[PDB]
Amino acid sequence: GSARRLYVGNIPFGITEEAMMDFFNAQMRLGGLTQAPGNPVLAVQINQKNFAFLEFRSVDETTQAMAFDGIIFQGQSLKIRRP
Ligand SMILES: [Zn+2]
Ligand SMILES: [Zn+2]
């Protein structure tokens, strides 16, 4: 379970879970981070503190997404860390 989640900080205020999921799924797939068909991100939980947890379908894709630390999303540099 913790091996399938990442902390994502400095998210744009007001973003939706769908927007964050769609961005990560599209960009991870385009960037070659996945090795199996389909979408790597299952869910996004945005805190009540400017951060979210992304939940992935696999431990593999959780690890690959660490390559996106610092990715720019809606003009913000996302901080990606293990929980
Ligand atoms: Zn969508
Ligand atoms: Zn939700």
Closest ligand, as measured to the CA of 21: 1
User: How many angstroms is it from 13 CA to the middle of ligand 1?
Assistant: 18
Residue (of 53, 71, 49, 68) closest to 17 by Cα position: 53
Distance CA 4, CA 43 (A): 11
Name the structure determination technique: X-ray
Distance CA 67, CA 61 (A): 10
Number of other residues whose CB lies within 10 A of the CB of residue 6? 23
Closest ligand, as measured to the CA of 25: 1
User: How many angstroms is it from 25 CA to the middle of ligand 1?
Assistant: 10
CATH topology of domain 1-83: Alpha-Beta Plaits (3.30.70)
User: How many angstroms is it from 22 CA to the middle of ligand 1?
Assistant: 5
What does the block give as tokens for 50? 């400017």
